[PDB]
Structure 1
Amino acid sequence: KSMAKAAGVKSVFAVGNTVYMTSFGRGNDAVLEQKIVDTSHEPLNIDDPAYQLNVVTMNGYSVTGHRGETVSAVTDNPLRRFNGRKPEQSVPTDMLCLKPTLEKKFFGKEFDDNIHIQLIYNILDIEKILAVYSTNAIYALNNMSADENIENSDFFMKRTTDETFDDFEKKKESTNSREKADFDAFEKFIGNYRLAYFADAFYVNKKNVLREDKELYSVLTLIGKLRHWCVHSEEGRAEFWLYKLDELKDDFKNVLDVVYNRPVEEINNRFIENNKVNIQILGSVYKNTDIAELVRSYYEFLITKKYKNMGFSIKKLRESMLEGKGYADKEYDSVRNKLYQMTDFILYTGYINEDSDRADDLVNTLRSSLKEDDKTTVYCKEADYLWKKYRESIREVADALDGDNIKKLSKSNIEIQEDKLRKCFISYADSVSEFTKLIYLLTRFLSGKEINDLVTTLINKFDNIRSFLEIMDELGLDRTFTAEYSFFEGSTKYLAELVELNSFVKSCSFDINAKRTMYRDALDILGIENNGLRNFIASNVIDSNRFKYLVRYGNPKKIRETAKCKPAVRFVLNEIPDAQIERYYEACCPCSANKRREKLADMIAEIKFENFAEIKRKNQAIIRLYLTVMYIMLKNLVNVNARYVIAFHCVERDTKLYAESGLEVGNIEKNKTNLTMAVMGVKLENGIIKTEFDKSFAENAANRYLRNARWYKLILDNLKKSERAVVNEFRNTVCHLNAIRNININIKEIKEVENYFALYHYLIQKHLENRFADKKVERDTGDFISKLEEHKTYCKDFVKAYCTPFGYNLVRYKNLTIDGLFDKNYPGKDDS
């Protein structure tokens, strides 16, 4: 990024008439380095400072870094932000000018600093990412109905954790038509075989059998409420719902526990098997502590390598000491290939239980050493020490680890008491907080890449929150949250939970015994419509991790009709590297890369086998190419949709803050553009914005983004072209993924696909055409639809018309309306 980070400036904070500077501690920890009053400074961290101040000025501070490869950098004084070249110093606002309201929301008072708002914006990013993956999860559940109804039924949208199943079953005989249809919708859902795609959530190994209705309902109700709370903005106490999950009724806690216990128990039991003999031998050779603490330590050192602190090749030291001894030979058969690794733990305990002075002297020598020659000499002396002082006990290991003794000990266990054993490995539900269990439930419906992105984003944002909460203690600032957000005072615990979650969370497998139902989908995803070949194709499809995504987020024969779109196929296989195109074509065919792409783009469209040796590998080559192409396409469209889900989430959230700040924002459900009009200070009359542009409006625009006349005038001009109904149906298309559901109709006629932005917006614009074709449409929307039929490509004007709700955040509006600005990975020229 920047020289300030390279110099080690982790942050610069303002606190009244004082400025504080920080550097990177261990991990994401911050340490205080300097304070500036005015043109004058005082050092901190005096025993290991990361950088020094070369000269301090009111414009900015110059620094030189000791912490690494030395660089010289300059950093700008936060108090002169917005105050250079025309009261000359002030604590900066956020761009939205919501800082006083956000501070008065999460904490009780306005704070006169800019440390609190960074924490708050991390809280807002946690909700931002949950709105995305909860929307994806509910879409994945709703897709199960797509073979029976095209509509996104309300059954998932209305659910709340207020109604327990015992007052919902009362609807079975209720007289009210909607409540009856709601229960018959639940009965229709629980009978669908496609629950087998989510076996880890809905099935219990007890063959594995479908759970009792009360738990299926409680799962659906939890995920539905999580979506409703993320995508809408709640009123009253429901706003605090995610932060008051301790208040959930017993059925939801019990279902969360019984879902979370099945991965934990499995992994907490595998380790008690693959290790029995090793743990017993260690528990005999060592007697120095309660054996549960030995087992804890062995688990900890096996699963966490501690290289973030013990950052040196202890394994090289081991080899340097054991080389040339029988310990490096077939002295006994048991460990010539594997099973050797407790020797490392013997070394590790030889560092933890004693000679920690030598370990600290080693860590110092490793900091002071210059050459690999030095580290090698030190390793040789450590080998000379350890091989005489402590290693002799491994001879008793060599006595204990004989093969028949291994076989005997395999019939035995460590005899830790059950309630102690269950507290020396991965914690069970009883200990894990409801938030992490609900995150695990959400992850049950997601792809592995989505699980990784979600969990690591949560880890990062909680670690940031923790770091700021630590900073505020040393600075002596008021840290105490409002009572309703006191959840975040446990954030250091939740980070420890989330990093534990990342240690075992994994993609939802299918039921192994269920595959004979997926067979029909596995054939209908290709369009194959003697039996051994068909069974082989089915088995080589159902095992594919790409099929497991593609059939959960899409209807298979709808994917097969989508694969007839030669332009989109040709585009997505243009982005496959040429060497991969060779690796496919050499396997599928038995000469330019363009003509080979074109040929396999026709092969993948006419793909079939039949009417309902290496040949098998040829068949795999055809299958693996096909599923890969569609996987890349649909994933990226879903990833484009998430960006607009965030945008509408923000529209909902910031409206309530702008309303809370005193702006007459109006009804955001009647017209999503009301906030932008409110921020622009313009008001509709008779359905038209009458006002022309004037500088006096921009100079009074309610946020910093809209202060500039150029983009204010452009947003006003595009907003006069918007239409209420089209923006609302765009919003619902985004929140329901209807554009991706109806992909075989929206994609029917495209000339060319330039990028996934153009494809996604063609899908939306053709959906809006299909929704408004039978309705009265006003002038500019009719022109946009005309240009959408004259050119079989998305209208660049229409997207910047219907995206006008986001205009209040100019950076978001630009990013979501100009391609090449859209994707971090594919930069390009902006227009206008």
Structure 2
Amino acid sequence: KSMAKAAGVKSVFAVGNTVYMTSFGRGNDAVLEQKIVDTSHEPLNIDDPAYQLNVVTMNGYSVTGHRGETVSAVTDNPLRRFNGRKPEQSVPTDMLCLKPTLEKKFFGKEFDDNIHIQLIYNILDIEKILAVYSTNAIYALNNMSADENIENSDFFMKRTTDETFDDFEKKKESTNSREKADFDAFEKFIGNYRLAYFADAFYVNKKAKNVLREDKELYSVLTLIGKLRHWCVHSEEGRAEFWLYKLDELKDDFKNVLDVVYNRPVEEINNRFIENNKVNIQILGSVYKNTDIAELVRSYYEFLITKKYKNMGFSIKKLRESMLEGKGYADKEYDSVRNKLYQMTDFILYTGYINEDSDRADDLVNTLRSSLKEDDKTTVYCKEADYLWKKYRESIREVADALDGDNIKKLSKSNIEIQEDKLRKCFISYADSVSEFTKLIYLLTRFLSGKEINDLVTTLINKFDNIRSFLEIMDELGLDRTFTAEYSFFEGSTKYLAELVELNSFVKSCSFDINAKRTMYRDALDILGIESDKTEEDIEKMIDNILQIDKKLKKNNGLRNFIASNVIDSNRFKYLVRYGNPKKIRETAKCKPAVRFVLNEIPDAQIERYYEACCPCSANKRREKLADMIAEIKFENFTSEAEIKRKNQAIIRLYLTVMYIMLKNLVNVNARYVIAFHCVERDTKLYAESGLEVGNIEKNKTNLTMAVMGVKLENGIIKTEFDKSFAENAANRYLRNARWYKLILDNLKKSERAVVNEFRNTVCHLNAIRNININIKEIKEVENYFALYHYLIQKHLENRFADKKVERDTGDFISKLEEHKTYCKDFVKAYCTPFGYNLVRYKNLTIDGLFDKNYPGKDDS
């Protein structure tokens, strides 16, 4: 929407007395355009300008650019920020007024410019996007313990890298009671049958078989994840504050375990590439007679794994099926080998366009870049496809007639020896030459969904690209880039970016272990709610009897083998079994308002499909009628009678989707408050250095927002009222406003230290939705996930504060929370006060409508 950004004005920096401007270069690169010194402009980039200045004024610059459509826009002078209607030109400061402190921390001294602060804030944001995912992985691992009752377990909380497994093993005969339980929890964790759900991190493939890793390696993985969560959320004093940025000093055991876990896919991709694609390689070698097979395998590797020339500027898939349309290859005979035939045809087209038809590819991309309507694009594709078919008909037929029958088997067993030294110089780098930060990121991604795997890496790509662009900009201007010894990790930001993009080239979701079907069957029974009178030591025997494991399902066993054949292998069940406690997600599925409201986010196509598969007329009554089908699903104990069974068998996928969506987005909601508390700790640490008496944050979490606001606690409560002088003497720019200072003070006067402490503990340990089955029991309506999550956490707080002394404000809040079966809109802003020093974050995390980026709504005062 910003016409200034549309016209190409990437940034407006301000260093010293001058002001520099930049434009959008190639991708995320920034290129200087011109500099301003007191309404006098000296242009830069004379060779290829991006925009020109029409009139330059003290309070703004007018530009016109030709990025897309010629649009004229106006920018504002950075030196004039906070210098309007009441020394008129100075470098702007941040909202928190921590710019000098952050600069003196990251770099060796103060800087009289606002370029370094943006890089520092990007570095800070790197930690923000890691705490959300790191505490999410810890949620899954801690939840894999399958605790049935109320669970407050904390295993990874105490884990630290400073001690190795040799010292940890010394706690077996230790005379301290706490260390006994510390070791017993680890023993129970490694003895768990559900570690097979993360076989890529907990299992090693050594006919051979994949077995559980050694205890030392399991402990190292667990300690690494726990310490990453600890460092991401908390802010430790001393050298522990720079653990992620000085992972070089990790112990030998942790280094070796990181190397081993990272080497698992790379060895599977490089060392057995020929063995995995032998049939295709041999067929292509027979086709391309004149080429060298050593170069052919390298080209195939570039086409499949690296995929660096694949961005040819046109859709090879669409080209291939415009070429093959209307021919004999659409028959039902070739679907058994389509997966190889189509890919080999794509490789043939890609090689042709790379080598001999590069000019034709350039002409095609030029024509496509100026295309008007959809009719033109398909016509150009049809013409190119006609040429490609007339050129490659014989080769395609030769491939197709040698891709069936005994020939596939013969080429699948025949040995092929190939000089591979050419392929080595293109193989993706092993763990030997890959940095510990990226290896740790890879290890972390083993414990979360594939969608979050992509999101976590890509955000890191963007952040490191921004860091690199900022660093490059300050080298052109002659500024200082050299970080202090604490943060020297960022000097190699280019190589970290390269390693991260290389990792993203091949990263996939977590992989199960083939010997993990009995546990998944039991888990599916628990999730669907099928119960048996048999004990724990007999249900396993019954599962072994039915499976007789490579499955051998007996005849006419009914739901017993129906589940084993149709619900263990489902992708939805794979997603849900590693996320959410199986014996708990059934009870929360009984919340009719919760399932009814979550069904609104489900696509109107999925809803129609599953309504047509259960009932035999508006969408609202459709959703309502299928919501109670999801809620009260039932089965047997372990015409219409079979019909009501088939209905519940059909509703299984929608049930699993509903549960997974609810749990995932509730954890996403909790991630915001995890980030907020991390920020509170970090900013307390920063303000402590700047010269502000912040007190002890651990005792009272509102100490930051009290010291910044200027108030203090005496006799347990604040004895200071509103006075306009306090607003203007605030430590940061957020609280300089009188009305919001007053509102934050008012909400702060009705909070409790213990309540805020437990809010912090519940947000960090994720207990609010770990005991979701208890805290969701009585809800009248659900309006959004903000409301649902806050109801859950308020119910948890009331449940624990049942017998402890609670003062008038919290008592009134709990009374409201019990009278109305919905979250109390005042309790949230009462216990959200530790974020008051950051007013925008505080308002985002208190009133809904402002909470969600994708769901804007009206804000009430």
Rounded Cα–Cα distance in structure 2 between residues aligned with 1:325 and 1:156? 60
Rounded Cα–Cα distance in structure 2 between residues aligned with 1:167 and 1:141? 23
Aligned partners of 1:49 and 1:66 also within 8 Å:
no
Report the CA distance between 1:22 and its aligned residue.
1.8
Rounded Cα–Cα distance in structure 1 between residues aligned with 2:218 and 2:77? 56
Report the CA distance between 1:505 and its aligned residue.
2.0
Aligned partners of 1:3 and 1:72 also within 8 Å:
yes
- Which shows bigger deviation, 606-615 or 702-711? 606-615
Q: Which string of whole-angstrom CA distances, capped at 9 and with x for unpartnered residues, describes residues 378-426 of structure 1?
A: 9999999999999999999999999999887766677556676455222
Structure 1 residues 370 and 174, CA, compared in 2 at 3 Å: closer, same or farther?
A: closer
Report the CA distance between 1:621 and its aligned residue.
2.1
Report the CA distance between 1:308 and its aligned residue.
9.3
Q: Which string of whole-angstrom CA distances, capped at 9 and with x for unpartnered residues, describes residues 169-219 of structure 1?
A: 111111111112211121121112121222222122329321111111111
Aligned partners of 1:142 and 1:152 also within 8 Å:
no
SS across alignment from 1:333? coil
Aligned partners of 2:295 and 2:422 also within 8 Å:
no
Structure 1 residues 326 and 475, CA, compared in 2 at 3 Å: closer, same or farther?
A: farther
Report the CA distance between 1:304 and its aligned residue.
5.9
Report the CA distance between 1:283 and its aligned residue.
7.3
Structure 1 residues 435 and 283, CA, compared in 2 at 3 Å: closer, same or farther?
A: farther
Match of 2:710 among 681, 692, 709: 681
Structure 1 residues 531 and 632, CA, compared in 2 at 3 Å: closer, same or farther?
A: same
Report the CA distance between 1:362 and its aligned residue.
9.2
Mark the runs of 5 or more structure 1 residues left unpaired by the alignment.
none
Report the CA distance between 1:168 and its aligned residue.
1.0
Aligned partners of 1:523 and 1:538 also within 8 Å:
no
- Which shows bigger deviation, 570-579 or 714-723? 570-579
Structure 1 residues 693 and 167, CA, compared in 2 at 3 Å: closer, same or farther?
A: same
Report the CA distance between 1:136 and its aligned residue.
1.3
Report the CA distance between 1:520 and its aligned residue.
1.6
Aligned partners of 2:148 and 2:584 also within 8 Å:
no
- Which shows bigger deviation, 362-371 or 81-90? 362-371
Aligned partners of 1:276 and 1:409 also within 8 Å:
yes
Structure 1 residues 379 and 194, CA, compared in 2 at 3 Å: closer, same or farther?
A: closer
Structure 1 residues 654 and 587, CA, compared in 2 at 3 Å: closer, same or farther?
A: same
Report the CA distance between 1:543 and its aligned residue.
2.4
SS across alignment from 2:715? coil
Establish whether residue 812 from structure 1 lines up as the match of residue 814 from structure 2.
no
Aligned partners of 1:108 and 1:481 also within 8 Å:
yes
Structure 1 residues 329 and 18, CA, compared in 2 at 3 Å: closer, same or farther?
A: farther
Match of 1:625 among 654, 678, 697: 654
SS across alignment from 2:342? coil
Structure 1 residues 287 and 49, CA, compared in 2 at 3 Å: closer, same or farther?
A: farther
Q: Which string of whole-angstrom CA distances, capped at 9 and with x for unpartnered residues, describes residues 691-719 of structure 1?
A: 11111111110001111011001001111
Structure 1 residues 131 and 419, CA, compared in 2 at 3 Å: closer, same or farther?
A: farther
Q: Which string of whole-angstrom CA distances, capped at 9 and with x for unpartnered residues, describes residues 105-132 of structure 1?
A: 1111112121111111111111111111
Matches within 5 A, 1:152-551: 152-206=152-206, 208-268=210-270, 271-273=273-275, 275-276=277-278, 279=281, 295-303=297-305, 310-312=312-314, 339=341, 415=417, 421-527=423-529, 531-551=557-577
Report the CA distance between 1:580 and its aligned residue.
3.4
Aligned partners of 1:330 and 1:336 also within 8 Å:
no
Report the CA distance between 1:51 and its aligned residue.
2.1
Match of 1:88 in 2: 88
RMSD between superposed Cα atoms in Å? 4.0
- Which shows bigger deviation, 283-292 or 67-76? 283-292
Mark the runs of 5 or more structure 2 residues left unpaired by the alignment.
530-554
Report the CA distance between 1:563 and its aligned residue.
1.4
Structure 1 residues 593 and 89, CA, compared in 2 at 3 Å: closer, same or farther?
A: same
Report the CA distance between 1:292 and its aligned residue.
6.2
Q: Which string of whole-angstrom CA distances, capped at 9 and with x for unpartnered residues, describes residues 151-175 of structure 1?
A: 4334311111111111111111111
Report the CA distance between 1:333 and its aligned residue.
15
Structure 1 residues 205 and 820, CA, compared in 2 at 3 Å: closer, same or farther?
A: same
Report the CA distance between 1:348 and its aligned residue.
6.0
Report the CA distance between 1:271 and its aligned residue.
3.8
Match of 2:539 in 1: none
Structure 1 residues 687 and 433, CA, compared in 2 at 3 Å: closer, same or farther?
A: same
Report the CA distance between 1:434 and its aligned residue.
1.3
Structure 1 residues 729 and 398, CA, compared in 2 at 3 Å: closer, same or farther?
A: closer
Rounded Cα–Cα distance in structure 2 between residues aligned with 1:524 and 1:400? 49
Match of 2:767 in 1: 738
SS across alignment from 1:556? coil
Report the CA distance between 1:510 and its aligned residue.
2.4
Establish whether residue 825 from structure 1 lines up as the match of residue 854 from structure 2.
yes
Rounded Cα–Cα distance in structure 2 between residues aligned with 1:570 and 1:335? 44
Rounded Cα–Cα distance in structure 2 between residues aligned with 1:365 and 1:622? 49
Rounded Cα–Cα distance in structure 2 between residues aligned with 1:753 and 1:382? 55
Structure 1 residues 383 and 290, CA, compared in 2 at 3 Å: closer, same or farther?
A: same
Aligned partners of 1:422 and 1:428 also within 8 Å:
no
Rounded Cα–Cα distance in structure 2 between residues aligned with 1:569 and 1:336? 41
Rounded Cα–Cα distance in structure 1 between residues aligned with 2:156 and 2:838? 31
Rounded Cα–Cα distance in structure 1 between residues aligned with 2:146 and 2:337? 55
Aligned partners of 2:303 and 2:309 also within 8 Å:
no
- Which shows bigger deviation, 178-187 or 412-421? 412-421
Structure 1 residues 395 and 84, CA, compared in 2 at 3 Å: closer, same or farther?
A: same
Rounded Cα–Cα distance in structure 1 between residues aligned with 2:834 and 2:508? 37
- Which shows bigger deviation, 694-703 or 425-434? 425-434
Structure 1 residues 31 and 403, CA, compared in 2 at 3 Å: closer, same or farther?
A: farther
Q: Which string of whole-angstrom CA distances, capped at 9 and with x for unpartnered residues, describes residues 68-104 of structure 1?
A: 2222211112111111222111111111111111111
Q: Which string of whole-angstrom CA distances, capped at 9 and with x for unpartnered residues, describes residues 726-754 of structure 1?
A: 00000000001111111121111111111
Rounded Cα–Cα distance in structure 2 between residues aligned with 1:286 and 1:394? 12
Structure 1 residues 607 and 731, CA, compared in 2 at 3 Å: closer, same or farther?
A: same
Aligned partners of 2:280 and 2:344 also within 8 Å:
yes
Q: Number of residues paired by the alignment?
A: 831
Structure 1 residues 286 and 31, CA, compared in 2 at 3 Å: closer, same or farther?
A: farther
Identity of aligned residues (%): 100
| Length-normalised TM-score, structure 2 | 0.87
Q: Which string of whole-angstrom CA distances, capped at 9 and with x for unpartnered residues, describes residues 248-282 of structure 1?
A: 11111121122122222223356424544665687
Rounded Cα–Cα distance in structure 2 between residues aligned with 1:359 and 1:596? 51
Rounded Cα–Cα distance in structure 2 between residues aligned with 1:693 and 1:602? 52
Aligned partners of 1:671 and 1:728 also within 8 Å:
yes
Q: Which string of whole-angstrom CA distances, capped at 9 and with x for unpartnered residues, describes residues 364-386 of structure 1?
A: 89889999999999999999999
